[PDB]
Amino acid sequence: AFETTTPPEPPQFPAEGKINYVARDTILEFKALPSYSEPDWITEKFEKAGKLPPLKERLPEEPLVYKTGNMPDGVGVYGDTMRHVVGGRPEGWNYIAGQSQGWGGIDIALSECLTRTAPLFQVDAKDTEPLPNLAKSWEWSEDGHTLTMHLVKGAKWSDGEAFNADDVMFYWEDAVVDPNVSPLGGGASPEAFGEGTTLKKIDDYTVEWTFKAAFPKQYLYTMAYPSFCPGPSHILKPQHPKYSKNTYNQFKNAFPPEYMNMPVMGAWVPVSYRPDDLIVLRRNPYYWKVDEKGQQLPYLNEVHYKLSTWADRDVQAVAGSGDFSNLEQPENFVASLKRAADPNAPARLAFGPRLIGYNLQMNFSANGWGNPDERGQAIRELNRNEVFRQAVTSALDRKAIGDSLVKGPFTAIYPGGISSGTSFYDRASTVYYPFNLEGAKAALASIGLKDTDGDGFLNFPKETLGGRNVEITLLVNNGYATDKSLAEGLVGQMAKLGLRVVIHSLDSNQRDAAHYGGQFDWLVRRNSTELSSVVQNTEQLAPVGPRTSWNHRSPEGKELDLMPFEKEMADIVRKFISSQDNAERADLMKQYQKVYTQNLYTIGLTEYPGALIVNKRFSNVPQGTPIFMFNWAEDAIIRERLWVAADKQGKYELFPQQLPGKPGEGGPINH
Ligand SMILES: OC[C@H]1O[C@H](OC[C@H]2O[C@H](OC[C@H]3O[C@H](O[C@]4(CO)O[C@H](CO)[C@@H](O)[C@H]4O)[C@H](O)[C@@H](O)[C@@H]3O)[C@@H](O)[C@H](O)[C@H]2O)[C@H](O)[C@@H](O)[C@H]1O
Ligand SMILES: [Ca+2]
Ligand SMILES: [Ca+2]
Ligand SMILES: [Ca+2]
Ligand SMILES: [Ca+2]
Ligand SMILES: [Ca+2]
């Protein structure tokens, strides 16, 4: 019906950053050091004044020790503030109940996981085991169905309470398993860990996973951010409906933004908050990570999250008032590159591979996800028709989509699927539907879509919705110029095709709620880690479970109304997860890409590289760090390991020589 080909090779993109590829165990280890150290004011103004227990006590028996060999600039010194600028707003501190803290690094910093994957951009292999984090070690039984997992022994919460299997178990049973709780990120359903996966407590520092599959090693990546971030059980358990008189909404909102010093396993603790202004975090005294020389991390004493816009993060990182940006909006590229062109610029800018992608996602549930009306249901039915999808992708002039964001060598013709920047990507396996408006018009006419009332907009046949003009509801994020630009352009291209598209502009919190709830026909969405890395949240590549897919979920409780190609992709993804052979895995992903792009699981909008922007005074920033691969750069750069030379240090501390107070109190502690 259409003359499909493979996508054209994008312009050669050098002016990048090269990664220094290292072995997995070059970064950290767990061991006891002969002696430990911390900032002198802690020992002098807090420990000597009674206010805090000595360092050796508040640390695990074997802390997480960062190795100097992997440190880009070596061991650091204490001091300074890391100033972030975010476009998000805090909902509260209950991460495990699906509350957002404002993004742009704050939840990443606060919610430490069993494993860690973002620093893996620098590891040579893609068969690589995620790094040990809160789970210090793990072993597989001979059969490969049981995974014993050992936790950090002797670690404490920012408040002094012990960290144990009870906090790990509280998350599994009362957040993941509990059908009434939805952890942050939207992908923490029990099936994300495998259909039929069980987990049980062995002792205070040992847990045991039981998997249906033999060695589904890919699930260790799911135990990283955002899917397995345990919360303080001693604080959250008395507020949980299963253990109290609170509703699930009462539990979700039990710790609002005004509640200070929320127990965390993270490097910094929230000590101050002003609505639509700022969140201040001070170093966690009970932090369980050290360098090889015994200095307790983080090196940085303070973190700021300025509550602004995502565009203002770029503005501020190049102005020098903000210390970090993920330059990801092509509308912002030229302005930022001009400022970066000055040798006196306070920040450095480095582009990486093309890993930022946008897809048009069509809701494929005809079995009632998001409780559709007659108009909604008729769109679900068009969405599931392969001819309708083929015409929609053919009506898109992808060179015009790319130019509308930024001219030059940034954008690449993106038809959907695995990003062109990933090693798993095969151009020969990617189905490209070139721009063909006339063929697309004819394709829609072949499925009964004709303009009957002469207003230049295609009507359903009289047997469907009374023969009224087709109207599609497109869900978009308010927070970004790119999402808005893409949404408007799409409406314009669909108009030339004869289809009437109505924009549904929502703020990030409401958008995510409307997405995961199924209350959408179509949606503009920036790709998550599975299309940028494959190995991170692999379960999200296909509808392997009832809530794993972003565009095809089933209502609670009902079976998945899978189309044949979805069943094919799910078989390809399940095979990949349990595969131990690398060549098999590489071919499974050529197979996957082919079924995806030919059948149009999603419809690609565009793809381009982003740039990491970091203030020049920071040391230990890894060379060629991507803005997004296994996670966002905020996690990948290992912020608790960043430092500033004493002679280059800023004077930005709003609570100098202060520590976090007790949870629920006013804020920090002096004097
Ligand atoms: O946090 C660092 C980041 O902040 C800004 O982007 C944040 C983004 O927030 C909302 O994201 C929810 C997102 O959740 C899911 O995506 C993943 C995969 O599970 O979950 C993690 C984040 O929770 C990531 O590692 C993702 O790979 C889900 O798949 C998806 O539908 C949701 O959109 C989102 O609503 C909103 O667009 C943003 O505000 C910032 O832009 C980044 O540069 C970076 O600093
Ligand atoms: Ca070393
Ligand atoms: Ca080096
Ligand atoms: Ca200091
Ligand atoms: Ca927490
Ligand atoms: Ca009409």
Q: HEC string of 414-464?
A: CCCCCCCCCCCCCHHHCCECCCCHHHHHHHHHCCCCECCCCCCCCECCCCC
- Please state, in angstroms and rounded to a whole number, the distance separating the CA atoms of residues 321 and 101: 21
* Residues sharing a CB contact under 8 Å with residue 332, sequence separation 6 or more, in sequence order: 311, 314, 481
CB 148 within 8 A of CB 138: yes
Tell me whether strands 278-283 and 289-291 are parallel, antiparallel or unpaired. Answer: unpaired
Q: Which of 248, 356, 253 is nearest to 604 (CA)?
A: 356
Distances from the Cα of 519 to the Cαs of 376, 390, 475, 525, in angstroms? 9, 24, 9, 15
Where does 34-173 show beta strands of DSSP type E?
64-66, 81-86, 115-116, 131-132, 135-140, 146-151
Give the closest residue (by CA) to ligand 1 atom 12: 185
479 in contact with ligand 1, CB cutoff 6 A: yes
DSSP structure class, residue 46: I
> If you measure from the C-alpha of residue 69 to the centroid of ligand 2, how many angstroms do you get, rounded to a whole number?
4
> If you measure from the C-alpha of residue 79 to the centroid of ligand 4, how many angstroms do you get, rounded to a whole number?
4
> If you measure from the C-alpha of residue 497 to the centroid of ligand 6, how many angstroms do you get, rounded to a whole number?
12
Give the closest residue (by CA) to ligand 1 atom 38: 508
- Please state, in angstroms and rounded to a whole number, the distance separating the CA atoms of residues 439 and 460: 19
Residue found under tokens 């109304």: 561
Q: Which of 559, 632, 631 is nearest to 324 (CA)?
A: 632
| Residue 553: CA count within 13 A, CB half-sphere | 25
- Please state, in angstroms and rounded to a whole number, the distance separating the CA atoms of residues 473 and 487: 11
In the chain, residues preceding a discontinuity (C to N beyond 2.5 A) are: none
Shortest-distance ligand to the CA of residue 20: 3
Q: Which of 548, 480, 497, 233 is nearest to 391 (CA)?
A: 497
Atom of ligand 1 nearest to the CA of 627: 43
Q: Residue ranges of the alpha helices (H) in 421-580?
A: 437-445, 481-497, 508-516, 529-533, 564-577
- Please state, in angstroms and rounded to a whole number, the distance separating the CA atoms of residues 304 and 277: 10
Give the closest residue (by CA) to ligand 1 atom 44: 104
CB 309 within 8 A of CB 88: no
- Please state, in angstroms and rounded to a whole number, the distance separating the CA atoms of residues 349 and 336: 9
Through-space distance between the first and last CA atoms of the chain, rounded to whole angstroms: 76
CB 326 within 8 A of CB 667: no
Q: Which of 481, 530, 532 is nearest to 505 (CA)?
A: 481
Cis, bond preceding 671 (omega within 30 deg of 0): yes
Residue found under tokens 């709780």: 181
Q: Which of 482, 475, 585, 533 is nearest to 222 (CA)?
A: 533
Method by which the model was determined: X-ray
Cis, bond preceding 144 (omega within 30 deg of 0): no
360 in contact with ligand 1, CB cutoff 6 A: no
Residue 624 Ramachandran class (φ > 0 left, ψ -120 to 50 alpha, else beta): left
Which residues are 604's β-sheet partners? 359
* Residues sharing a CB contact under 8 Å with residue 583, sequence separation 6 or more, in sequence order: none
Atom of ligand 1 nearest to the CA of 108: 1
Sheet containing 302-307, strands listed edge to edge, beginning at the edge strand earlier in sequence: 81-86, 302-307, 278-283, 268-274
> If you measure from the C-alpha of residue 294 to the centroid of ligand 2, how many angstroms do you get, rounded to a whole number?
14
CB 603 within 8 A of CB 359: yes
147 in contact with ligand 1, CB cutoff 6 A: no
CB 546 within 8 A of CB 560: yes
**CA angle (159, 160, 164) in 5-degree steps:** 110
**CA angle (449, 483, 535) in 5-degree steps:** 95
CB 602 within 8 A of CB 359: yes
Rg (CA), the chain: 25
38 in contact with ligand 1, CB cutoff 6 A: no
> If you measure from the C-alpha of residue 313 to the centroid of ligand 4, how many angstroms do you get, rounded to a whole number?
26
If residue 407 lies in a helix (H) or strand (E), which one and from where to where? Answer: none
537 in contact with ligand 1, CB cutoff 6 A: yes
186 in contact with ligand 1, CB cutoff 6 A: yes
- Please state, in angstroms and rounded to a whole number, the distance separating the CA atoms of residues 366 and 580: 36
Question: Cβ of 627: how many Cβ atoms within 10 Å?
Answer: 22
Q: What is the three-class DSSP state of 475?
A: strand
Dihedral sign for Cα 108, 114, 120, 121, please: negative
Residue found under tokens 């259409």: 2
Type of residue at 639: R
Residue found under tokens 């002016």: 15
- Exposure string (b/e) for 521-550, b if CB count within 10 Å is 16 or more? bbbbbbbbbbbbbbbbbbbbbbbbbbbbbb
Shortest-distance ligand to the CA of residue 624: 3
CB 101 within 8 A of CB 93: yes
Shortest-distance ligand to the CA of residue 71: 3
CB 288 within 8 A of CB 155: yes
Atom of ligand 1 nearest to the CA of 480: 37
CB 93 within 8 A of CB 281: no
185 in contact with ligand 1, CB cutoff 6 A: yes
Three-state secondary structure string covering 355-393: CEEEEEEECCCCCCCCCCCHHHHHHHHHHCCHHHHHHHH
- Please state, in angstroms and rounded to a whole number, the distance separating the CA atoms of residues 121 and 235: 35
Sheet containing 135-140, strands listed edge to edge, beginning at the edge strand earlier in sequence: 135-140, 146-151, 206-210, 198-203
- Please state, in angstroms and rounded to a whole number, the distance separating the CA atoms of residues 335 and 323: 17
DSSP structure class, residue 152: P
- Please state, in angstroms and rounded to a whole number, the distance separating the CA atoms of residues 492 and 622: 42
CB 78 within 8 A of CB 302: no
Tell me whether strands 198-203 and 206-210 are parallel, antiparallel or unpaired. Answer: antiparallel
> If you measure from the C-alpha of residue 52 to the centroid of ligand 5, how many angstroms do you get, rounded to a whole number?
21
CB 16 within 8 A of CB 352: yes
Q: In the structure encoding, which two tokens stand for residue 366, read together?
A: 């005809």
Shortest-distance ligand to the CA of residue 66: 2
Which residues are 22's β-sheet partners? 123
- Please state, in angstroms and rounded to a whole number, the distance separating the CA atoms of residues 314 and 327: 6
Question: What does residue 296 show for φ and ψ, rounded to 5 degrees?
Answer: -70, 130
Q: In the structure encoding, which two tokens stand for residue 418, read together?
A: 């695995």
- Please state, in angstroms and rounded to a whole number, the distance separating the CA atoms of residues 451 and 440: 14
- Please state, in angstroms and rounded to a whole number, the distance separating the CA atoms of residues 518 and 5: 33
- Please state, in angstroms and rounded to a whole number, the distance separating the CA atoms of residues 171 and 110: 16
Q: State the resolution, in angstroms.
A: 2.1
98 in contact with ligand 1, CB cutoff 6 A: no
| Residue 296: CA count within 13 A, CB half-sphere | 27
Helix then strand then coil, % of the chain, to nearest 5: 30, 20, 50
Atom of ligand 1 nearest to the CA of 87: 39
* Residues sharing a CB contact under 8 Å with residue 192, sequence separation 6 or more, in sequence order: 222, 227, 537, 539, 540, 545, 548
326 in contact with ligand 1, CB cutoff 6 A: yes
Residue found under tokens 């929609």: 392
- Please state, in angstroms and rounded to a whole number, the distance separating the CA atoms of residues 474 and 185: 21
> If you measure from the C-alpha of residue 479 to the centroid of ligand 1, how many angstroms do you get, rounded to a whole number?
12
17 exposed, middle or buried (CB, 10 Å; 0-12, 13-18, 19+)? middle
- Please state, in angstroms and rounded to a whole number, the distance separating the CA atoms of residues 157 and 162: 6
Distances from the Cα of 619 to the Cαs of 40, 315, 467, 637, in angstroms? 21, 22, 64, 11
508 in contact with ligand 1, CB cutoff 6 A: yes
Dihedral sign for Cα 316, 317, 322, 324, please: positive
| Residue 11: CA count within 13 A, CB half-sphere | 12
- Please state, in angstroms and rounded to a whole number, the distance separating the CA atoms of residues 560 and 552: 8
Give the closest residue (by CA) to ligand 1 atom 8: 103
Q: In the structure encoding, which two tokens stand for residue 543, read together?
A: 């509808």
Question: What does residue 314 show for φ and ψ, rounded to 5 degrees?
Answer: -65, -45
- Please state, in angstroms and rounded to a whole number, the distance separating the CA atoms of residues 630 and 538: 11
* Residues sharing a CB contact under 8 Å with residue 541, sequence separation 6 or more, in sequence order: 530, 531, 534, 569, 573, 592
Atom of ligand 1 nearest to the CA of 509: 35
Residue found under tokens 């408040």: 159
> If you measure from the C-alpha of residue 456 to the centroid of ligand 1, how many angstroms do you get, rounded to a whole number?
38
- Please state, in angstroms and rounded to a whole number, the distance separating the CA atoms of residues 219 and 119: 17
Residue found under tokens 């951010």: 225
Type of residue at 281: L
Type of residue at 212: K
Question: Cβ of 453: how many Cβ atoms within 10 Å?
Answer: 10
357 in contact with ligand 1, CB cutoff 6 A: no
Question: What is the chain's length?
Answer: 671
Which of 89, 91, 103, 507 has most ligand 1 atoms within 8 Å of its beta carbon, as the pocket-test mutant? Answer: 103
